[PDB]
Amino acid sequence: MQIFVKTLTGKTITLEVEPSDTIENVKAKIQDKEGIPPDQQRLIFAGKQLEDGRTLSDYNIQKESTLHLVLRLRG
């Protein structure tokens, strides 16, 4: 299935994914297109922060769902 990600530029990318992909899997896909490392990625869906160990199905993220990418800086 396809989901969309609102990137740090404000544009929208399309990701090919499976219901059981982890948030970590999605972050790896995002780095390939945008050049942001997973550690600096925070993903938002329906106003909620997504945890690396959980899957798209866990959050009931269906096809054409839109995730928001937000920069995570520490220190």
Added chain:
Amino acid sequence: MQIFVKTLTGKTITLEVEPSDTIENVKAKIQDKEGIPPDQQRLIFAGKQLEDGRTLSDYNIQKESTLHLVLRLRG
């Protein structure tokens, strides 16, 4: 000759048909009544998905037989 078409939502459609009607004809009839494109229709009878080119009689679909309409997710 009359048949019933049940949708996922438990809705019951009644169609006027003939034994020689093709599944394509049935889909055209459903598009007339419900406005759904044949492309997006899957028709099932006795657990079997019906093929566009075959007829109701090919499938032993009779007066007052019930078909199930499954929709192909858009996209």
